[PDB]
Design a protein around this ligand. Structure first.
Ligand SMILES: CCCCCCCCCCCCCCCCCC(=O)OC[C@H](COP(=O)([O-])OCC(O)COP(=O)([O-])OC[C@@H](COC(=O)CCCCCCCCCCCCCCCCC)OC(=O)CCCCCCCCCCCCCCCCC)OC(=O)CCCCCCCCCCCCCCCCC
Ligand SMILES: CCCCCCCCCCCCCCCCCC(=O)O[C@@H](COC(=O)CCCCCCCCCCCCCCC)COP(=O)(O)OC[C@H](O)CO
Ligand SMILES: CCCCCCCCCCCCCCCCCC(=O)O[C@@H](COC(=O)CCCCCCCCCCCCCCC)COP(=O)(O)OC[C@H](O)CO
Ligand SMILES: CCCCCCCCCCCCCCCCCC(=O)O[C@@H](COC(=O)CCCCCCCCCCCCCCC)COP(=O)(O)OC[C@H](O)CO
Ligand SMILES: CCCCCCCCCCCCCCCCCCCC(=O)O[C@H](COC(=O)CCCCCCCCCCCCCC)COP(=O)(O)OCCN
Ligand SMILES: CCCCCCCCCCCCCCCCCCCC(=O)O[C@H](COC(=O)CCCCCCCCCCCCCC)COP(=O)(O)OCCN
Ligand SMILES: CCCCCCCCCCCCCCCCCCCC(=O)O[C@H](COC(=O)CCCCCCCCCCCCCC)COP(=O)(O)OCCN
Ligand SMILES: CCCCCCCCCCCCCCCCCCCC(=O)O[C@H](COC(=O)CCCCCCCCCCCCCC)COP(=O)(O)OCCN
Ligand SMILES: CCCCCCCCCCCCCCCCCCCC(=O)O[C@H](COC(=O)CCCCCCCCCCCCCC)COP(=O)(O)OCCN
Ligand SMILES: CCCCCCCCCCCCCCCCCC(=O)OC[C@H](COP(=O)(O)O)OC(=O)CCCCCCCCCCCCCCCCC
Ligand SMILES: COC1=C(OC)C(=O)C(C/C=C(\C)CC/C=C(\C)CC/C=C(/C)CC/C=C(\C)CCC=C(C)C)=C(C)C1=O
Lengths: 665, 48, 70, 494, 90, 76
């Protein structure tokens, strides 16, 4: 039954891909949805068996890569963290398949789309179930591939092709980091097996030579792994691909780049906590990165005009909260927040997709408004998702976000203080942009086109069902799962997560914090909602500044254009490599110097020299006789009259003057 | 009878005898280390 | 109209043939001297010195003399 | 000493098969095109099955050479030559025997104009290359490698597409001959010490650290031209692009492997001290090649030029692996050699499918082919993924095992070599999306045909082999470990 | 023909090899190289067997693995220092 | 469109509406179930559960690898 969980989506994708011509749209929609839904049901049973039953499952199929000590295998590990991720992935994927059945109903190529959805699901399952670093790497690359295939699903669109290539290349930079980390792990422990590495990780203390520097080996490994996490979770270094991945169809944005694949970095940090716990330096790095990312994405998202863009920058900010929770040694809380975000963000992406579908694919919020009464169900779903995201009390997002903020407050370190400040201000920013989206889309007097209003329609049933289920999740899952996952002293995780005693801060955060600290999230959220109301309803001239002041205009641009991060990277890095490839490697070297001091130059000189030697055969019999006389004279001179010579003469000068004669006239 | 048992027997019949293969290997070296002296004597023969 | 063969465009073929015959354009200019000095001598030497030092740093980490090379 | 082997299927008959095919084809009139086609195809297929049998009788526990048989040149018996394989050369014999029928099949449609000379040239190439891989003697390795130059020269010059094939063939011949002459010089210096060229004896003689330095340089001068290593790599793009499709397949899939085979077979075990002394040098050259050539690949505008430049980066990764001198390194180098031989050959076949219909190599003319050639598009995407070392494909196994081997010796060289993951992805995906994705351009191309049955069949074994090595490389690594281990240990006794 | 069964080799190092001058008995030199390779594989196979113990103790003992696996972890890490042809010489 | 009706693909191309798609869908579902039977058998054979569950679980019906890894000292 555990193999069925992993391989059922592969079977569905294979039938939709290889035999979609016999099933058509309808058959392929059914085949793929059934297989993923059955995998989801079995995943629920596995959650009951493994997490609630406290009975982990281990399954080894066969060796994959066996070379001396290198022991990569086709092996599956089912512990509490694994079944939590299994529920998230399979449930959201089943819902997204069901939603797509109706969302892509008019698309010409729905069977290929469903096949791609299922193959992504299979690779994500391979990722979260692997019992060693190499199977995890296979899942990592597979979800990268499926994401690329889905981002440019509309292959005729040049924007989509650029976005997909950008996503693949940023992910490869993370995969580089991840692969270097895996190499270091194998070198230190002589294995890539998770169980062996975690059993051994507390012992090594040795230093390593990495790029002509002496570093602590565990710390080096952990930072290298975190680089791959930074790639897959769109953290500060490698974040710019996520907003552009909105080029794919909305179900892809819901499933891939908001719920499951974008959280693979958080999952990998949580799964490797028995290793990361012995690298305080790496934890400090992680803390800083997550904090910076939350602030970056929050400030960027407040001026976006596209719905999907706003919701993607939200995801990036939420991923930052999850990364610093991990960096302050609170992995259970980060995974709890991951599971909670998978409900509200999927509800938000699917609700936005419903709005966009109803508005004839209009995505600009400036051409919307006055839509609350026309789409009541969709408006309610978006409200519930937004309230759960901003951390409205007792909703699903309230139980994890504020616990992370309280834990950051309780981390009495430099990076803990940094994370507390940045997350606190980011709360205000996210409340602002969430309510700005709600107000511009549904509540302001309408700014839309009449032809759009006169052709509107709310969700068909295969679309509304997942929205209802995600709304229920976004209301109740937090409260319902809080004690199980982060309740004081809970044994729910068993040995899946490791917190060393010296890093345990959950009691002190629930008990030693001033009552004020616990309210700043509600207060900042309320202030952000109020500021959004004032900006988007009672402001009739706070836009003159952007048209009359150069400094205010550049700042508006700064924040709308994502801090100019893509511009700077493309201008100084991508263009640099592209120019090297033509001007140095090819033109100055390969086709330049190497051709001149090679076949081009050699051919030139040997042609000119053969030319000169041919001319000595002048055709004149006198030259031929003279040559014989000269050779005879040379013979006598060198071989008999070189006795006294040696006093004035040297052999060096002899052969030098010979060669030098070639360069005459 | 069974396919595989026949296949086992057939594959073993195809294969070198490992003992004999490793023994001609010793004769070549022992004979070549001590045989490497004869030819070099002709190359040292005086032309005059 | 007739044929699977591509209908050639004169400018595209000129661009391609210019790409195939770049070696006829090399002039030992100042820019080319700098680019060959930096990327054809200096950078390989720097990489070689890096690789060797890496081995020497391993050598001294193991309480061993520097391994001779080349 | 007659070293005749007990086994029924041995090396000499596998040598003789394509020879007999060539002699028979010499005498059949060109009017009997069907007979010529069938005879050549059947000879190549029988040779492939013979090599498969040789794989079954292989003994994966010994460090010795197997099927060793001998070959007696003079009645004086001073000079007597031996053939034999091990776990490092076996799969290369298999790859050669497998690729040759593919070459005959690629030119099936044009055989009426190709003639029997095409099939005879490829069969002679097959005979010479199998010989080269099966030789336990430096001097015959030399003789059989230079011999392939003649049929390869003919193949490039006669059936190349355009007049640039002239320059390409000249450069191929002259570069390769220069390298070969350097290694002839090395062979004679060895002979002056030892009085022999038998590989088994040279593996048991001691060379001075000084004599080792000079002999290693003279071997390097052949092998680096063969690999190719920078800066003697510039013959490769010209030759591999101007050659006919099957010629490119043989050049990239087999002939390129001869330099790395020479490094594995003579340089590393015969001169271990020099091998140690030169390791930083090899690491630097290979790392420079990987970065610079990948970046040059990025800016190429010709399909065949992009696939040909890709091979330079892959082979220099192979050299890093083999000079790491451990199990991961050498195992990964051999596995990547075989995987490259499959993947680059399939990519050249894809480009050839496109060129046979449209007669252009310029990327700008193509685009939007997914809508007219979906089967070709899918197969092309698969081999594009394989060329990026995607996990699950055969090339990833060798790539990662080589990175493992390098990291344990020098973390900087592994770090520079792992940059290939980023650059190879970039150029592979850019090529695929510019060829297959986007819209059609009917002013350039308006008439299309997807793959016929022959082309689909040709692709099937490449797909099967790539997936098979990618998911279960144990079948290959189990037959190689003893040989690889003895290569790694040779020269040390602790 | 190969008889059925696992390959058989001599348990002992060849008699005829002089570590001082190893290029003196070529046959013994080859045999010693093969014997050392086989011995090295026996050490790799020992470290792999000790790894299976750690794997299962971690899995069976859960949060008590630190105190229960300690001796097995020490044994495995000692066997892995100077194993095969990795980052340790002899 | 117009030319795409002459283009064969495995996924069926644009707006694919096979006439017998219901019967074909049923045949595909029967095939996936038949393929799933051996996978389930192999999974049940391969599963390893070192710990007895707190309450009875469905996998106890078909899997007989509960509490077998207790003597990890003898693992090889
Ligand atoms: C005291 C001054 C020191 C120098 C004395 C020479 C006099 C002089 O240069 O003029 C004075 C001169 C200017 O004074 P002035 O007021 O104009 O008076 C001029 C006189 O009346 C004199 O004026 P004039 O017009 O009567 O004489 C001009 C003089 C000027 O003297 C010079 O020759 C100097 C100019 C040479 C500089 C070259 C620069 C390179 C530029 C080429 C760029 C190519 C790049 C291309 C790349 C590609 C582009 C895209 O030329 C000569 O007549 C001298 C002959 C020397 C010839 C040298 C080469 C001969 C070889 C054959 C020809 C070339 C073939 C190639 C082979 C190369 C050889 C291996 O003073 C200086 O420039 C000071 C020199 C400072 C040097 C640093 C300190 C030196 C001391 C170090 C001590 C440490 C111990
Ligand atoms: C044997 C080693 C040789 C290289 C040694 C290392 C490098 C030393 C420094 C460089 C030496 C050669 C300098 C050449 C200067 C450029 C000369 C020139 O004009 O270039 C022409 C091409 O000639 C060369 O570049 C010469 C190539 C030399 C390469 C090596 C020579 C042959 C070596 C092999 C044979 C000998 C073997 C001896 C082995 C010991 C270009 O032809 P053109 O008519 O277009 O020129 C117009 C001009 O630019 C003004 O507009
Ligand atoms: C063209 C070959 C280079 C010049 C000729 C040459 O030096 O030949 C050497 C060819 O060997 C090479 O290293 C070839 C170099 C090719 C690179 C140019 C052999 O001489 P050696 O110095 O290696 O041998 C001396 C030994 O100590 C006596 O036993
Ligand atoms: C192992 C099991 C893997 C099962 C995956 C199913 C693969 C799906 C078959 C390929 C899809 C195909 O047929 O190509 C379509 C289009 O071709 C492509 O898009 C080319 C890309 C094919 C992508 C297939 C790769 C799937 C990813 C899996 C990777 C495998 C894992 C690698 C490691 C082993 C056909 O066109 P269409 O029906 O969509 O209509 C559009 C037509 O062109 C014009 O209207
Ligand atoms: C935003 C998140 C970015 C993630 C990676 C950023 C790295 C920042 C590292 C700062 C912390 C640090 O210096 O730790 C060092 C660890 O080595 C390292 O940090 C190794 C970093 C190498 C990763 C870069 C991979 C690219 C290839 C190599 C390039 C190296 C050049 C530098 C760019 C030394 O800490 P310690 O070991 O001494 O522990 C005891 C500390 N007192
Ligand atoms: C660490 C330092 C070392 C690292 C390695 C660096 C090495 C640098 C590169 C050296 C390798 C160069 C290899 C020589 C190949 C030359 C190929 C030229 C042939 C070619 O394509 O053009 C022909 C020119 O031939 C001709 O007319 C010319 C004659 C043929 C050339 C052969 C001369 C080479 C002899 C040895 C040179 C090197 C010495 C080695 C120590 C045709 O021309 P066309 O169109 O006019 O003909 C009439 C047409 N049918
Ligand atoms: C060996 C070391 C390198 C040799 C390089 C030979 C270059 C020959 C060369 O180009 O010089 C030409 C004279 O040839 C000669 O006189 C060549 C003599 C023989 C050289 C080889 C021995 C003059 O040609 P140029 O440099 O004036 O051409 C540019 C006109 N604008
Ligand atoms: C540590 C050193 C290791 C060995 C490196 C090689 C030897 C050292 C460098 C030698 C430099 C010689 C002097 C060069 C500077 C003088 C410049 C004078 C003016 C000038 O431009 O003269 C040019 C002479 O070029 C020339 O004569 C070209 C100079 C030789 C370039 C050597 C390139 C080496 C290989 C590069 C790397 C390859 C591998 C990369 C992976 C011809 O001017 P012009 O007027 O004809 O110009 C075309 C106009 N129409
Ligand atoms: C074409 C390919 C040629 C590749 C060139 C090899 C690069 C490294 C050269 C090493 C130089 C070297 O070690 O010096 C001597 C070798 O003889 C030499 O000087 C090398 C002779 C080969 C001819 C010159 C090669 C380039 C010209 C083209 C021996 O000196 P040593 O005993 O001090 O070695 C140190 C031992 N620890
Ligand atoms: C929740 C369960 C799915 C309900 C879907 C019914 C949709 C509907 O009302 O049809 C009207 C619906 C559209 O009508 P409208 O929404 O009223 O406009 O028709 C469809 O397009 C949907 C009908 C077929 C597609 C959904 C069923 C196929 C997938 C079944 C997957 C089963 C997985 C679970 C099995 C065990 C695991
Ligand atoms: C392009 O510009 C020009 C030159 O430049 C090449 C010239 O000078 C000449 C011609 C003048 C010369 C070179 C007279 C010298 C002739 C000699 C030495 C006669 C000997 C015979 C021949 C053919 C040369 C072969 C001799 C050799 C190799 C030496 C002897 C052999 C041994 C080492 C034993 C002219 C007209 C010219 O306009």
């Amino acid at each position: 039954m555990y193999l069925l969980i992993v391989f059922l989506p592969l079977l569905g994708s294979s039938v939709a891909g290889f035999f979609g011509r016999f099933l058509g749209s309808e058959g392929s929609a059914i085949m793929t949805t059934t297989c993923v839904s059955f995998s989801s049901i079995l995943s629920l049973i596995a959650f009951y068996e493994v997490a609630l039953g406290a009975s982990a499952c281990y399954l080894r199929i066969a060796p994959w890569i066996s070379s001396e000590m290198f022991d990569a295998s086709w092996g599956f590990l089912f512990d509490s963290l694994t079944v939590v991720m299994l529920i998230v992935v399979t449930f959201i994927s089943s819902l997204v398949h069901l939603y797509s059945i109706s969302y892509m109903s008019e698309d010409p190529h729905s069977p290929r789309f469903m096949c791609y959805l299922s193959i992504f699901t299979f690779f994500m399952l391979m990722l979260v179930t692997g019992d060693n670093f190499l199977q995890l790497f296979l899942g990592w690359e597979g979800v990268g591939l499926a994401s690329y295939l889905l981002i440019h699903f509309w292959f005729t669109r040049l924007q989509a092709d650029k976005a997909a290539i950008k996503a693949m290349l940023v992910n490869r930079v993370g995969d580089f980091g991840l692969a270097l980390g895996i190499l270091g792990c194998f070198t230190l422990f002589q294995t890539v097996d998770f169980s062996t590495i975690f059993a051994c990780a507390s012992v090594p203390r040795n230093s390593w030579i990495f790029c002509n520097m002496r570093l602590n080996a565990i710390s080096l490994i952990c930072i290298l792994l975190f680089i791959g996490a930074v790639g897959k979770s769109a953290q500060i270094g490698l974040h710019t691909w996520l907003p552009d991945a909105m080029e794919g169809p909305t179900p892809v944005s819901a499933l891939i780049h908001a719920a499951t694949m974008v959280t693979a970095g958080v999952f990998m940090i949580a799964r490797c906590s028995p290793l990361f716990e012995y690298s305080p330096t790496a934890l400090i790095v992680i803390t800083f990165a997550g904090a910076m990312t939350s602030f970056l994405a929050a400030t960027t998202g407040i001026l976006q005009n596209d719905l999907k863009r706003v919701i993607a920058y939200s995801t990036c900010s939420q991923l930052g909260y999850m990364i610093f929770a991990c960096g302050i040694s609170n992995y259970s809380v980060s995974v709890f927040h991951l599971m909670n975000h998978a409900f509200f963000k999927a509800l938000l992406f699917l609700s936005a997709g419903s709005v966009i579908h109803a508005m004839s694919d209009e995505q600009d919020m400036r051409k919307m408004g006055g839509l609350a009464s026309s789409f009541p169900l969709t408006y309610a779903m978006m409200l519930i998702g937004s309230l759960s995201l901003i951390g409205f009390p007792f909703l699903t997002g309230f139980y994890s976000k504020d616990v992370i903020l309280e834990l950051a407050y309780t981390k009495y370190t430099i990076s803990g203080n940094f994370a507390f400040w940045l997350g606190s201000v980011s709360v205000l920013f996210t409340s602002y942009y969430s309510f700005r989206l709600l107000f511009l889309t549904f509540l302001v007097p309408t700014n839309s086109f009449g032809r759009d209003i006169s052709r509107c329609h709310d969700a068909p049933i295969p679309m509304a069902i997942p929205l209802i289920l995600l709304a229920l999740g976004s209301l109740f899952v937090g409260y319902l799962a809080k004690d199980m996952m982060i309740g004081l002293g809970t044994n729910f995780w068993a040995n899946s997560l490791l917190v060393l005693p010296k890093n345990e801060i959950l009691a002190e955060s629930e008990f030693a914090a001033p009552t004020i600290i616990k309210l700043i999230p509600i207060l900042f959220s309320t202030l952000g909602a109020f500021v959004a109301y004032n900006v988007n309803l009672v402001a009739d001239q706070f836009q003159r500044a952007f048209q009359t002041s150069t400094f205010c205009n550049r700042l508006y641009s700064f924040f709308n254009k994502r801090w100019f991060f893509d511009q700077v990277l493309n201008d100084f890095l991508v263009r640099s490599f592209l120019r090297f490839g033509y001007e140095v490697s090819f033109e100055a070297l390969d086709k330049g110097a190497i051709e001149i001091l090679g076949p081009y130059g050699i051919s030139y000189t040997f042609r000119r020299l053969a030319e000169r030697i041919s001319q000595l055969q002048s055709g004149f019999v006198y030259h031929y006789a003279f040559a014989m006389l000269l050779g005879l004279t040379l013979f006598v001179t060198f071989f008999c009259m070189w006795d006294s010579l040696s006093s004035w003469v040297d052999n060096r000068l002899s052969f030098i003057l010979i060669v030098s004669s070639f360069y005459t006239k | 009878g069974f396919i595989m048992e026949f296949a086992e027997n057939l594959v073993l019949r195809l294969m070198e005898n490992p003992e004999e293969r490793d023994r001609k290997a010793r004769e070549h070296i022992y004979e070549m280390h001590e045989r490497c002296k004869k030819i070099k004597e002709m190359w040292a023969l005086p032309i005059r | 109209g007739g044929g699977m063969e591509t209908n050639k465009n004169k400018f595209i073929e000129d661009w391609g043939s210019a790409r195939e015959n770049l070696e006829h354009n090399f002039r030992w200019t100042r820019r080319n001297f700098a680019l060959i000095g930096i990327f054809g001598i200096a950078l390989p030497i720097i990489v070689y010195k890096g690789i060797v030092k890496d081995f020497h740093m391993q050598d001294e980490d193991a309480g061993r003399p520097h391994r001779k090379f080349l | 000493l007659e070293h005749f082997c007990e086994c029924y299927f041995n090396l000499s008959g596998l040598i003789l098969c394509p020879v007999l095919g060539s002699i028979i084809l010499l005498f059949i009139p060109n009017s009997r095109i069907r007979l010529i086609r069938l005879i050549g195809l059947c000879a190549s297929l029988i040779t492939f099955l013979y090599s498969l049998v040789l794989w079954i009788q292989f003994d994966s526990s010994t460090a010795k050479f197997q099927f060793v048989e001998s070959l007696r040149w003079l009645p004086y018996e001073n000079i007597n030559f031996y053939l034999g394989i091990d776990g490092i050369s076996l799969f290369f014999v298999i790859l050669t025997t497998f690729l040759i029928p593919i070459c005959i099949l690629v030119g099936w449609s044009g055989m009426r104009s190709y003639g029997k000379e095409y099939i005879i040239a490829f069969l002679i190439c097959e005979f010479l290359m199998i010989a080269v891989f099966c030789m336990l003697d430096l001097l015959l390795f030399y003789v059989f490698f230079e011999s392939v130059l003649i049929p390869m020269f003919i193949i490039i010059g006669v059936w190349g597409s355009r007049q640039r094939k002239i320059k390409a063939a000249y450069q191929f011949f002259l570069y390769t001959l220069l390298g070969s002459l350097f290694m002839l010089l090395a062979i004679l210096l060895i002979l002056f010490q030892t009085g022999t060229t038998d590989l088994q004896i040279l593996l048991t003689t001691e060379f001075s650290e000084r004599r080792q330095i000079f002999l290693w340089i003279a071997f390097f001068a052949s092998f680096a031209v063969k690999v190719p290593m920078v800066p003697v790599h510039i013959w490769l793009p010209e030759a591999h692009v101007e050659a006919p499709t099957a010629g490119s397949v043989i050049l990239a899939g087999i002939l390129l492997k001869f330099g790395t085979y020479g490094f594995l077979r003579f340089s590393i075990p015969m001169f271990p001290e020099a091998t140690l002394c030169f390791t930083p040098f090899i690491y630097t050259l290979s790392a420079i090649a990987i970065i610079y050539t990948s970046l040059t690949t990025l800016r190429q505008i010709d399909l065949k030029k992009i696939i040909a430049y890709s091979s330079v980066a892959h082979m220099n990764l192979v050299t890093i692996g083999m000079f790491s001198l451990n199990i991961q390194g050498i195992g990964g180098s051999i596995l990547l050699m075989l995987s490259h031989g499959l993947v680059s050959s399939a990519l050249f076949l894809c480009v050839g499918v496109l060129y046979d219909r449209h007669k252009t190599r310029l990327v700008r003319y193509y685009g939007g082919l997914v809508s007219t050639m979906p089967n070709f598009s899918t197969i092309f995407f698969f081999f594009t993924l394989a060329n990026m070392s995607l996990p699950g494909t055969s090339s990833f196994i060798g790539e990662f095992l080589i990175l493992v081997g390098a990291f344990q010796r020098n973390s900087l060289v592994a770090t520079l070599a792992a940059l290939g993951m980023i650059l190879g992805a970039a150029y592979s995906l850019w090529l695929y999306n510019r060829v297959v994705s986007g819209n059609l351009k009917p002013d350039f191309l308006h008439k299309f045909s997807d793959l016929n049955g022959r082309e689909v069949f040709i692709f099937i074994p490449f797909l099967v082999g790539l997936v098979w090595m990618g998911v279960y490389p144990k079948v290959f690594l189990d037959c190689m470990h003893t040989s690889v281990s003895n290569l790694v240990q040779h020269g040390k006794f602790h | 023909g190969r008889k059925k069964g696992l390959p058989e080799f001599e348990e002992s190092a060849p008699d005829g090899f002089d570590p001082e001058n190893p290029y003196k008995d070529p046959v013994a030199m080859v045999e010693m190289r093969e014997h050392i390779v086989r011995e090295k594989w026996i050490q790799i196979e020992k470290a792999k067997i000790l790894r299976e113990k750690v794997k299962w103790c971690y899995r069976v003992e859960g949060v008590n693995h630190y105190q229960k696996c300690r001796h097995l972890v020490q044994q495995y890490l000692d066997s892995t220092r100077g194993v095969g042809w990795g980052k340790d010489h002899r | 469109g117009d030319f795409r009706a002459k283009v064969w693909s495995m996924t069926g191309g644009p707006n694919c509406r096979p006439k017998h798609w219901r019967r074909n869908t049923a045949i595909a579902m029967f095939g996936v179930f038949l393929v799933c039977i051996p996978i389930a058998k192999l999974s049940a054979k391969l599963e390893q559960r070192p710990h007895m569950p707190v309450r009875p679980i469905p996998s106890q019906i078909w899997c007989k690898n509960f509490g077998t890894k207790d003597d990890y000292e003898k693992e090889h």
